[PDB]
């Protein structure tokens, strides 16, 4: 009930999709079902094609200075619907309701593709965002290469996301002895968006030097890899405390932090969740991948770590995941009480 | 011998440059938002403006007897203006090349020139440096009525060092950085892990070849004139011709507009000049 349809500006070639969301499982993703509808005319001398592109828009001001389109494609698929596997339950309902001129199309995304993650349009940076943008492009063509116009096509956009696993992960911990014995831990590995993060800072100094200030920092690693690997640091929450521990003594505290977008609207390099239009979403969900490192895994990979530092500077880093739970009904993918 | 060809090249460059320079300045300064690359393009367009302002005067200067019939006219001002324009254009070309070499591996922050204040201070520094190099005109230039015609002519090691420094600024700065950045990115030389599109490849090659064929002949002719000077003579070597180098210079200054900005996004916008819903489904 309540399928999503997008109609091209001319009165023909609309596209029906069951849901504008496709969870990315570790092994196999959900196939991109849907039915492209076309009027009886306008096709007798052509055929319909559906093309899915995993774009990598990464250019500011969306201007091609020297032919730099920035339109790097990570995966492209083609299907002919008006010349396979049996149709799922949803596709049969669309065929029955729409009529006999309801040509189905089905996609099968391979594993270890990056999820839909964008970067925050901070100062300047006018135009579109910087990140992976999946899209479904339905058009009529008979050569696979003839230039098609945006008017005679549907540029429906989809988003591929990943949700937190049911089984909680192992509790993270780290230590560092070099100058001072340090021990840190988190409450639980699985963290939902907006939930507080509690850390343990139980420490036992031994050196004559005494700590002056303590800082707990959370940063969001944007491991963007298109031509070379990157390990960008962008802080997302900070906690500076004046607490001090005397030499040959111990200090334990339960300082808590909470990452949110209210105070990070000006920072650059921050990665947000997948966006379909100019609305604002939350921080980018942590992306998890299977073993073997997936070779290079070209795309944007978001990982979260929390660190504790001493100012006198031994520091430790504790990874964790920041992911949404499995939704009950459906994500509307927009500010529900908008405007 | 080739004076007719040079005049034809002058006319073609002017005709293809005035509208091309006009369209880019208005489009960038009115429609598109101010970005560092857009400011580079607009500054290059302004350099083309003032560069071609004296081009109609250059028509009369390249007219009969390849001389300056406008008398004195304080032509120090417009000669310095033209040389300042050419220096500013080549400096904007090389800074665009450097910014493009920074453009690859885009997500990095690099030297943090994305701020508008840094772009404006760099532009004004470039203008001041080009005015410093383009400053000295009355120091050497004079005018005489020789062979029953007056000319704007320049006036022994001072001329040698002046031409040497002008050539080294016009070659080491633009051309060496173009070969370091453009050439050692397109031919897999130097770190070539960055893939390049076919359109990107072709347009970089066109930029490089146009720059070469338009500016290398002029610098080479200047160096040859400096070398053959102070020895032999001038009327035997017959250097009364060769305005083709300056014609190619004007061709480059009018071709860079259409090549740089009049592509991709601009092409579709100039040619030109639904909401997603839901539907029923029975259970």
């Amino acid at each position, epitope marked *: 009930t309540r399928v999503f*349809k997008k*109609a*091209s*500006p*001319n*009165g*023909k*070639l*609309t596209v029906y999709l069951g849901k504008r969301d496709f969870v990315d499982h570790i092994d196999l993703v959900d196939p991109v079902d849907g039915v492209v*509808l*076309v*009027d*009886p*005319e*306008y096709l007798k001398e052509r055929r319909v094609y559906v093309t899915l592109t995993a774009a990598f828009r990464y250019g500011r001001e969306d201007l091609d200075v020297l032919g730099l389109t920035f339109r790097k494609d990570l995966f492209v698929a083609n299907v002919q619907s008006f010349p396979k596997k049996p149709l799922t339950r949803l596709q049969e309902r669309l065929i029955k*309701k*729409l*009529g006999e001129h309801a040509y189905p199309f089905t996609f099968e995304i391979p594993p270890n593709l990056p999820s839909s993650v964008t970067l925050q349009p901070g100062p300047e940076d006018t135009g579109k965002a910087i990140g992976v943008d999946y899209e479904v492009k339905a058009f009529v063509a008979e050569n696979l290469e003839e230039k098609i116009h945006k008017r005679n096509s549907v540029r429906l956009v989809i988003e591929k996301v990943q949700y937190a696993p049911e089984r909680p992960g192992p509790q993270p911990t780290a230590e560092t002895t070099r100058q001072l014995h340090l021990e840190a831990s988190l409450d639980k590995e699985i963290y939902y968006h907006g939930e507080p993060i509690s850390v343990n800072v139980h420490v036992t100094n031994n050196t004559n030097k005494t700590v002056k200030k303590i800082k707990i920092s959370v940063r969001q690693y944007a491991d963007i890899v298109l031509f070379n690997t990157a390990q960008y640091k962008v802080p997302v929450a900070m906690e500076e405390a004046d607490d001090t521990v005397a030499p040959s003594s111990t200090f334990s505290k339960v300082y808590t932090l909470t990452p949110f977008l209210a105070n990070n609207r000006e920072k650059r390099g921050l990665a947000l969740d997948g966006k379909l239009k100019h609305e604002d979403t939350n921080l980018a969900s942590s992306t998890l991948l299977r073993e073997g490192a997936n070779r290079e895994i070209l795309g944007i990979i978001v990982s979260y770590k929390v660190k504790v530092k001493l100012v006198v500077d031994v520091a430790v880093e504790l990874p964790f995941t920041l992911m949404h739970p499995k939704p009950k009904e459906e994500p509307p993918h927009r500010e529900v009480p908008e405007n | 011998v080739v004076h007719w060809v040079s005049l034809v090249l002058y006319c073609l460059a002017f005709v293809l440059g005035i509208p091309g320079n006009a369209i880019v300045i208005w489009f960038t300064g009115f429609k598109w938002k101010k970005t560092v690359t857009t400011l580079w393009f607009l500054n290059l367009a302004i350099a083309d403006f003032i560069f071609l302002l004296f081009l109609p005067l250059y028509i009369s200067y390249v007219a009969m007897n390849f001389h300056w019939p406008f008398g004195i006219w304080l032509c120090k001002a417009n000669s310095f203006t033209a040389q300042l324009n050419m220096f500013a254009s080549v400096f904007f070309l090389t800074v665009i090349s450097l910014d493009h070499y920074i453009h690859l591996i885009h997500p990095v922050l690099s030297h943090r020139h994305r701020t508008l204040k840094n772009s404006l201070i760099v532009i004004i520094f470039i203008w001041l440096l080009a005015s410093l190099i383009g400053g000295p005109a009355l120091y050497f230039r004079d005018t005489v009525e020789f062979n029953n015609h007056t000319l704007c002519y320049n006036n022994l090691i001072r001329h040698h060092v002046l031409t040497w420094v002008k050539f080294i600024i016009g070659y080491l700065f633009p051309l060496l950085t173009m070969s370091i950045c453009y050439l050692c990115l397109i031919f897999k030389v130097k770190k070539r892990s960055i893939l390049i599109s076919s359109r990107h490849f072709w347009t970089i090659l066109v930029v490089v070849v146009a720059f070469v064929v338009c500016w290398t002949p002029y610098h080479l002719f200047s160096i040859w004139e400096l070398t053959i000077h102070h020895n032999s003579y001038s009327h035997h070597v017959m250097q009364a011709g060769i305005p083709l180098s300056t014609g190619l210079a004007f061709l480059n200054s009018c071709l860079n507009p259409i090549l740089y900005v009049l592509i991709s996004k601009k092409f579709q916008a100039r040619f030109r000049s*639904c909401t997603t*819903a839901s*539907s*029923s489904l*029975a259970k």
Partner: nanobody
Amino acid sequence: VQLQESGGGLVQAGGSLRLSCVVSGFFFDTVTMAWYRRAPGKHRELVASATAGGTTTYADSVKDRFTISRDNAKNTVYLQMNSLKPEDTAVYYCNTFVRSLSWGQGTQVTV
């Protein structure tokens, strides 16, 4: 997006209503503008196709019972009916065959 539907009323049996659909906006040109009907409590279903040329495809319960005409000059489409069964009670909507326009409030036809 105007979607002006008119020509509704109460008829005992076998009476034409002559519905009309007028749309303001993009011209029809070369698109197939269709007609849909929705019984109370049911879903929409196709009635007639009315392509740019003259080819009309009806439904199982509509064939040899209904007629359709299009007027391109006024950007409007009409339906003409005869021998209306009591089952015909439904809300008639007008929309492109591809279902690209917004579903405006249609007219009520009761038999």
